[PDB]
């Protein structure tokens, strides 16, 4: 179970990134940081020809509110993205035609200051879509839930033998899981992007959400972003 039913338009930063691995689409999050720059999780994009990924955006629902769709992406941009271990699982999109921001369905994430933690025992927004190859259109609707950070030590304890950095957050709530298509999917306080989700499959069982840092990566971003 993941989170409640949302419009689009109390979290306008999401975005579904849409890839193409082995001829079938798999869909992640993503967040807006403007016209031209779209924040996702590496894991989804790393090795794909970016020609194919579409960036699915102002979406309610992936199937009944479909949005807009920005085939346009022409970069991938890495930081140090670790394969085996899955450190630096941060991604930036460049697109060479850009987003119809309307400034209400689509709106672009502030970002925090450079190495922003949020605070523990507080409370972040995150948003997405879960999972793309299922068959019920619910299962396709814009979801969101507050989840309560917890404490990072504690939280790299029980994943045990699974290497987190130095760069993430964990957070939790009870009764409420991200799945692997949440990986990317923007990690809110107010309308300040903190987090990128990563996702574990191996992960075990009761295991908290782990978030990539946005602020461990923010002056990288900034360096981006200026490009256009």
Same mark, same amino acid.
């Given at each position: 179970?993941?989170?409640?039913?949302?419009?689009?338009?109390?979290?306008?930063?999401?975005?579904?990134?849409?890839?193409?691995?082995? @001829?079938?689409?798999?869909?992640?999050?993503?967040?807006?940081?403007?016209?031209?720059?779209?924040?996702?999780?590496?894991?989804?994009?790393?090795?794909?020809?970016?020609?194919?990924?579409?960036?699915?955006?102002?979406?309610?629902?992936?199937?009944?509110?479909?949005?807009?769709?920005?085939?346009?992406?022409?970069?991938?941009?890495?930081?140090?993205?670790?394969?085996?271990?899955?450190?630096?699982?941060?991604?930036?999109?460049?697109?060479?035609?850009?987003?119809?921001?309307?400034?209400?369905?689509?709106?672009?994430?502030?970002?925090?200051?450079? @190495?922003?933690?949020?605070?523990?025992?507080?409370?972040?927004?995150?948003?997405?879509?879960?999972?793309?190859?299922?068959?019920?259109?619910?299962?396709?609707?814009?979801?969101?839930?507050?989840?309560?950070?917890?404490?990072?030590?504690?939280?790299?304890?029980?994943?045990?033998?699974?290497?987190?950095?130095?760069?993430?957050?964990?957070?939790?709530?009870?009764?409420?899981?991200?799945?692997?298509?949440?990986?990317?999917?923007?990690?809110?306080?107010?309308?300040?992007?903190?987090?990128?989700?990563?996702?574990?499959?191996?992960?075990?069982?009761?295991?908290?959400?782990?978030?990539?840092?946005?602020?461990?990566?923010?002056?990288?971003?900034?360096?981006?972003?200026?490009?256009?």
């Amino acid at each position: 179970k993941g989170g409640e039913k949302t419009d689009i338009k109390q979290v306008p930063w999401t975005v579904a990134v849409r890839t193409y691995p082995g @001829e079938e689409s798999l869909t992640c999050g993503g967040a807006i940081l403007s016209q031209w720059f779209v924040l996702t999780a590496a894991h989804c994009v790393f090795d794909q020809k970016p020609e194919t990924i579409v960036i699915q955006y102002e979406s309610t629902n992936l199937w009944e509110d479909p949005g807009k769709s920005d085939p346009y992406v022409s970069h991938v941009y890495l930081s140090f993205y670790r394969q085996e271990t899955m450190e630096n699982d941060i991604a930036i999109l460049e697109l060479s035609r850009p987003l119809k921001l309307d400034g209400l369905k689509s709106k672009p994430a502030k970002l925090p200051d450079i @190495e922003f933690r949020p605070k523990t025992g507080s409370d972040v927004l995150v948003s997405g879509y879960g999972d793309g190859q299922t068959m019920d259109p619910k299962d396709h609707d814009l979801k969101s839930a507050q989840l309560t950070v917890v404490d990072l030590d504690e939280c790299r304890t029980k994943y045990g033998p699974i290497f987190l950095s130095l760069q993430v957050f964990c957070a939790q709530k009870v009764g409420v899981s991200l799945e692997s298509g949440d990986a990317g999917d923007p990690t809110v306080q107010q309308d300040t992007l903190v987090g990128v989700a990563a996702y574990f499959p191996k992960r075990p069982e009761g295991a908290p959400e782990v978030f990539t840092k946005v602020g461990s990566y923010v002056s990288w971003i900034q360096d981006i972003i200026k490009k256009k």
